[PDB]
Amino acid sequence: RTTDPVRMYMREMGTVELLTREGEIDIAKRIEDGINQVQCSVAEYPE
DNA sequence: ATTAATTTCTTGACCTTCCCCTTGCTGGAAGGTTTATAATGGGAGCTGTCACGGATGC
């Protein structure tokens, strides 16, 4: 509905919601869970 | 129609740079990697540009 790519980039930014401190450490814990799932699943690999 | 003293040709025998390299650093240039308090909706015309068609919405 516009012609500037940075304004619809700001629209796509405003589609998603920001984080508080507890949200920041929750997304950090989700990153930790996504890392540790591969870290424990690679322990079952013979290579 | 002949050849003997000059005058060129040819061949070793010498003469330079170009470039890579000598041990031992010394400096310069190109490319990639962290740094761990708090950092969360950014920014910039310029119109005082006017009169056409080509596509959009009643």
Question: How determined?
Answer: cryo-EM
Nucleic strand B near CB of residue A28 (< 7 Å): no
Contact A32, A26 (CB under 8 A): no
Positions in chain B where some atom is under 7 Å from a protein CB: 40-44
In angstroms, the CA of A14 and the C1' of B24 are apart by 63
Per-position DSSP letters for A15-42, written without gaps between them: HS----HHHHHHHHHHHHHHHHHHHHHG
Distance CA A14, CA A12 (A): 5
Nominal resolution in Å? 4.2
Query: Are A27 and A19 a contacting pair, CB within 8 Å?
Result: yes
